[PDB]
């Protein structure tokens, strides 16, 4: 096999951490006034979300129901980061809507789908 045992090896737990640590921070910047740094954080974190969502060999240390969200959470990010970059606008993603992923990420394993937002899962085999 590859995964090993169903559930969570242990490294996956370290992720949700470093991950949740990103968003948490990515926000800290916003509040203060570090959009630049913020974006980076979000993006970087977003990119990672994909690296796990899209995966390299459709592996993904996480299940399908998990990666789904992961691949989604990113989407939101793409909005947040952009929201920052965006100048002539003011109807994109907000913080609350962003921090709304803070828990999700953590409650990824215990995520019965039904995202509070309209964000499609980046990459992944659909239909079938």
Can you tell me which residue has the tokens 């990119």?
47
Distance of CA 69 to the CA centre of its chain: 7
Q: What tokens were used for 42? A: 């979000």
CATH topology of domain 1-128: 1.20.120
Of residues 57, 80, 74, 83, the one with CA closest to residue 108: 74
User: How many other β-carbons are positioned within 10 Å of the β-carbon of residue 35?
Assistant: 14
DSSP annotation of 107 reads T
Contact between residue 71 and residue 108 where contact means Cβ atoms under 8 Å apart: no
DSSP annotation of 91 reads -
Provide the greatest CA pair distance for the chain: 51
Q: How does DSSP assign 34-76, residue by residue?
A: -HHHHHHHHHHHHHHHHHHHT-SSS--SS-HHHHHHHHHHHHH
Q: What tokens were used for 88? A: 């002539």
Domain positions in the chain: 1-128
Contact between residue 97 and residue 117 where contact means Cβ atoms under 8 Å apart: yes
For the four alpha carbons of 7, 47, 79 and 24, in that order, the dihedral sign comes to positive
């Amino acid at each position: 096999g590859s995964s090993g045992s169903s559930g969570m090896s242990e490294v996956t737990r370290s992720l949700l951490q470093r991950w949740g640590a990103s968003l948490r921070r990515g926000a800290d910047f916003d509040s203060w006034g570090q959009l630049v740094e913020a974006i980076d954080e979000y993006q970087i974190l977003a990119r990672h979300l994909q690296k796990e969502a899209q995966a390299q060999h459709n592996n993904s240390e996480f299940t399908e129901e998990q990666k789904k969200t992961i691949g989604k959470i990113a989407t939101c990010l793409e909005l947040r980061s952009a929201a920052l970059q965006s100048t002539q606008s003011q109807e994109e993603f907000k913080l609350e809507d962003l921090k709304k992923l803070e828990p999700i990420l953590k409650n990824i394993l215990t995520y019965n789908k039904e995202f509070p937002f309209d964000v499609q899962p980046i990459s992944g085999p659909s239909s079938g």
